């Protein structure tokens, strides 16, 4: 249900951030076919996502509120993670509540 080999994800958001502060990174699908793509980030904290389908591709953005390590994984087209998932990213700054 189409390839996931074929989805390419960058930006600073999938590297780190700061607490509070939103992140952004861009996974681009336009030459991977017509499948579902999934986006989950697991770290100290449940995150707030937004996804907005650009020309570009689908730009994530997301606010971590506490600091550590978030693991970013993205799928695309079944249980398949693309190339680099999952993405590690070092959050930095107090933990807010
Ligand atoms: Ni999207």
Excluded: W
């Excluded at 939103?22 to 681009?28: K, Q």
């Excluded at 904290?45 to 970013?72: F, W």
């Excluded at 993205?74 to 807010?96: D, N």
């Amino acid at each position: 249900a189409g390839d996931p080999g074929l989805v390419s994800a960058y930006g600073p958001g999938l590297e780190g951030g700061t607490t509070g502060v939103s992140s952004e990174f861009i996974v681009n699908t336009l030459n991977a076919g017509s499948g579902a793509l999934s986006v989950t980030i697991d770290g100290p904290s449940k995150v707030q996502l937004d996804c907005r389908e650009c020309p570009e591709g689908h730009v994530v953005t997301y606010t971590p509120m506490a600091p550590g390590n978030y693991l970013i994984a993205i799928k695309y087209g079944g249980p398949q993670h693309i190339v680099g998932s999952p993405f590690k990213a070092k959050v930095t700054g107090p933990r807010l509540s």
